[PDB]
């Protein structure tokens, strides 16, 4: 691997995608991983106790931390965000600090570093660089896009070797319901459909389907996402963008169906047939240019995710329970 | 006028466009104007000593000021920026604070105000709401676009009655060379081609043309811009965008030629013929929907601007001279 024996920074490295990227980097034989993470939406147990892992429990927007940074990194993965859509809507200023300003202050610091081979930014999901002012359901979605603007600017103006990796609907081990601090809404606990469904199935309760589960999504397993981020780092064109995607869609009804089959959850599912009006990212560029393919099936990824959830269920419950009081008063 | 007897806030109201908008608002018989301006790129003499004008010499990002704001405004004009392209490139963080965060914190505060009929945002120049990640020569240009994203979001999510007014190449009385603090580069003094040309012509010196002055621009007189902003306030569709534009292009060679004719500047101009490759915003929407037309000719506007510059030349020179030391060491 081009990443063997390298020094890498993972901003947001204690998070869901981050922690899995860190695991993989260590597997690939990196020299050092510097995790920078304020634990706003993460648990310390998702960092490793590793001699190669240095952990700064600090915001990447902290001026002292930024000024302390040395030109000793080959690669930077910028994965920090304000998790997620619902939280951002609740408090756009909390989102801005942890989602927009993060990227700007990081790049501003990194712009004169010469050891950097690649700076990989996790963007929201061929690849086009045209955007509408009207997309944008949340401050979160806007912050993600702003990070792409910054990634293009810093490349053009300062030759910062940025690569934007667009993904969506990641799932897998290491996504903990209720991870971090209360960010204003029940989505702090119920972060995403897949871990919510897995948790509820493991507890033997009915999976709540919205509108018969007709919505489809391209789910991608987190270990494929980690490998895709690494491919972007190694071989992605500076200034460029790649979809990191499975190219396969699964209905929420089928997601639920599979989670129930795997867990043994015997409870009813109110599912409806999908109609053309219910749903009216290509992986080709990454495949062709980076040799990257996200090949873990929804069935295999779900099994792995459920296995991890089962093994860590008590810990996850203790973490969920810290938000009981905020949940009850929401 | 719909603005007669209203309470209006002008963020950035001590500036070039702002001060002229304030003058016009007072002419239209507004009840109160609250100018909020940190004077970062403005002079106090551009505010009026008026019983109707309240001046807060404070950033619009100041938390105390924001929390102090009352639901007592009919109209808000958000004209603050970090002046301008060159400065923003020099210090993207200074730009962010005074160009991106300004809009976000303002809107976040204004979002539950009920007396607001319109919030008018000065954007950078039919009207489309699709943008490229690759436009964007500066952090300034990105901040302007981000403000449009915010203006659309806050309208959709919170019914904030935003109107984006896109203009460019404003000129006229009240633009003072060297206004405000040093923002890192000589552009602090030499702000824009028109006042630079007028100042130099009045001093009897050769106007410096770049590449024979083949570049063309749609110049618009500041009093037309003020009236256009007022039309947006009165009649602009919430969530909407309008070009505020003359629809007429002038070459920098012709700009220079006219300034020399008006001032009597007898010095040479190195001008070249414009070729098709030298230059390879429609006013129709504003005309049709708002009854607005920017009809002041380049010849008439230049005369008015030169007259004002002549009358205030000593004051402008004293203001320019404060940057002598920063100029000499740049
Ligand atoms: N999971 C998905 O389906 C998905 C989809 C598209 C894009 N993304 C992007 O992937 C990246 C990782 O997201 P995730 O799903 O792992 O969520 P996450 O919340 O688990 O991870 C983000 C991490 O950023 C950290 N963080 C927040 N503010 C910080 C700050 N100021 N300084 C340093 N760290 C800070 C959090 O504590 C957390 O560990 C994000 O940039 C996100 O927007 C995720
Ligand atoms: N003049 C043009 O050709 C042009 C073209 C397109 C758009 N605009 C836009 O028009 C608006 C006015 O620009 P201008 O040309 O009058 O420049 P300007 O610099 O004279 O005015 C901007 C004002 O904002 C103030 N300001 C800066 N930071 C502030 C803050 N944090 N809080 C409150 N006030 C702050 C400055 O002190 C200044 O008075 C801007 O939004 C600008 O981006 C101007």
Author numbering:
A (entry chain A), B (entry chain A): 8 to 132, 147 to 301, 306 to 355
Manuscript text:
In WbmF, the last 30 residues form a large bent helix that covers two faces of the C-terminal domain. There is also an insertion of 14 amino acids in WbmF relative to the other structures, including all residues from Gly198 to Arg212. This extra loop extends over the nicotinamide end of the cofactor-binding pocket. In the WbmF structure the interface region is extended to include a short antiparallel β sheet composed of the residues Ile151 to Ser153 from each monomer as well as the loops that connect these strands to the bundle (Leu154 to Pro160); 2131 Å2 is buried in the WbmF dimer interface, which is equivalent to 8.6% of the total protein surface. His6-WbmG and His6-WbmH copurify with this compound from the E. coli expression host, but in order to stabilise the protein in solution His6-WbmF required the addition of exogenous cofactor, and this is the most likely source of this molecule in these His6-WbmF structures. In these structures, the bound cofactor is buried within the core of the protein; in the case of the His6-WbmF structure, the 14-amino-acid insertion supplies an additional occluding loop, further blocking release of cofactor in this conformation. The SDR triad is conserved in WbmG and WbmH as TYK but in WbmF Ala131 superimposes onto the Ser/Thr position. In GMER these residues are Cys109 and His179;21 in GDP-mannose 3,5-epimerase (GME) they are Cys145 and Lys217.12 In WbmG and WbmH these amino acids superimpose onto hydrophobic side chains, but in WbmF this catalytic cysteine is conserved (Cys133) and there are two candidates for the basic side chain, Asn213 and His90. His90 has a very unusual backbone conformation, with a cis peptide bond to the following residue. This is strongly suggestive of a functional role for this residue, since such conformations are rarely observed except where they are required to place a key side chain in the active site.
